[PDB]
């Protein structure tokens, strides 16, 4: 019945700090080292460091030296991870892990490499100072089938809904997931593939809706001048 339960999701401003906790149970807290692995959205796993609850000695990855502090409270069977001087690329899912390895760097005489056998459910941390902001919409004009769309740019916070021709056009429509730019604002695109023969007769308007800001924008996507 070994398990790790983590604290709730957090949104933080760049330059500040964030502290995530993790409670261990099902085994004697002082017997195994606990560490933190993070994962940027859509990226791989990135190890941050570990703490030995027996003695409190820590070992951090070089990339986070000077920015991270890991602590433990044996009475509550809880470890903490505090990351300071937050930047936009610190937006990630932060996993609490149990490392059965024995590291010299946290007081073990004989180094022994095992692995991370238990993972917590993860804590989502978002770094952005942005407030609620409606999006600006730009057209992705087209020149057999043609591709057209509209660019929903710099909004906050997710989500935004996109329909075409007040919902009349659904075939071939794809609305992509949003990407968090370093500015702290979200942006996505919505595409629809149409027959080229329709471009001179059929008007195409994408309808964006941003509920957090009560922003509704209709943008007409005209074909371009040239071929």
């Amino acid at each position: 019945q070994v398990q790790l339960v983590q604290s709730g999701a957090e949104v933080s401003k760049p330059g500040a700090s964030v502290k995530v906790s993790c409670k261990a149970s099902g085994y004697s807290f002082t017997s195994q080292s606990l560490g933190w692995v993070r994962q940027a959205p859509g990226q791989g796993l990135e190890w941050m460091g570990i703490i030995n609850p027996s003695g409190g000695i820590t070992n951090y990855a070089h990339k986070f030296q000077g920015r991270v502090t890991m602590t433990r409270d044996t009475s509550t069977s809880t470890v903490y991870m505090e990351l300071s001087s937050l930047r936009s690329e610190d937006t990630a899912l932060y996993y609490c892990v149990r490392d059965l390895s024995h590291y010299n760097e946290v007081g073990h005489d004989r180094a022994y490499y095992y692995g991370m056998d238990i993972w917590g459910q993860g804590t989502t941390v978002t770094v952005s100072s942005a407030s609620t902001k409606g999006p600006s919409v730009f057209p992705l004009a087209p020149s057999g089938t043609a591709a057209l769309g509209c660019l929903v740019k710099d909004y906050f916070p997710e989500p935004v809904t996109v329909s075409w021709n007040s919902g009349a056009l659904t075939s071939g429509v794809h609305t992509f997931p949003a990407v968090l730019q370093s500015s702290g604002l979200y942006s996505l695109s919505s595409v629809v593939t149409v027959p080229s023969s329709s471009l001179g007769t059929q008007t195409y308007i994408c309808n964006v809706n941003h509920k957090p800001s009560n922003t509704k924008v209709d943008k007409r996507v005209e074909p371009k001048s040239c071929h």
Partner: protein, 209 residues
């Protein structure tokens, strides 16, 4: 700093044997781990100490570490085995992960991606901004790598790419954006978006003219 090299994608059919490799300098000297991450949940340890299975892990999963490569092997692959797989080792007590490998159990034939490259709209250029939009659609398996080129030189800054998501037709789509100044747009003869899918590259090109 030590690095582990994994192939970004590996595909098999139901019941076939999947093999995911992980390469590193003298990797056979070190201990390796393999983690399985299904969409939406935490990673799971499937192999530790090169070839040991934690209790409860199916015996289809096997591992081997020799020379400079570590290998995870899944015999008789099932649909539930679709996940990202990470190799992991240590470099002076520091934990190191491979880039990860997307494993796809093929449920349909492969499909080459369709690439459409949108120049910056005149409404954006008139607003003193410029964004290139590379839209990729109708490909399978859902794994692509996007590379931007200024004329013939690679661009690295200002590139943001989304993770491939499923369409309504069970095929995948992805997007990539290159933000630059309006002046960077006019100063080059052409910009290119290269989408490599299953070893072959499809590229589109736009120009400020």
């Amino acid at each position: 700093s030590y690095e582990l090299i994994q192939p970004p994608s590996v595909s098999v059919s139901p019941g076939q044997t999947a093999s995911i490799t992980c390469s590193g300098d003298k990797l056979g000297k070190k201990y390796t781990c393999w983690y399985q991450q299904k969409p939406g949940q935490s990673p799971v340890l499937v192999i530790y100490q090169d070839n040991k299975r934690p209790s409860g892990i199916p015996e289809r999963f096997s591992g081997s570490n020799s020379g400079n490569t570590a290998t995870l092997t899944i015999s008789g692959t099932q649909a539930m085995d679709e996940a990202d797989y990470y190799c992991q080792a240590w470099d002076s007590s520091a934990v190191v992960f491979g880039g990860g490998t997307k494993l796809t159990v093929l449920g349909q034939p492969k499909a080459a991606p369709s690439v459409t490259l949108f120049p910056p709209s005149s409404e954006e250029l008139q607003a003193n901004k410029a964004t290139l939009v590379c839209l990729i659609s109708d490909f399978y398996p859902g794994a692509v790598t996007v590379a931007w080129k200024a004329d013939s030189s690679p661009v690295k800054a200002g590139v943001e790419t989304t993770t491939p998501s499923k369409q309504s037709n069970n095929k995948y789509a992805a997007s990539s954006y290159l933000s630059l100044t309006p002046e960077q747009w006019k100063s080059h003869r052409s910009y290119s978006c290269q989408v490599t899918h299953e070893g072959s590259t499809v590229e589109k090109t736009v120009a400020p003219t």
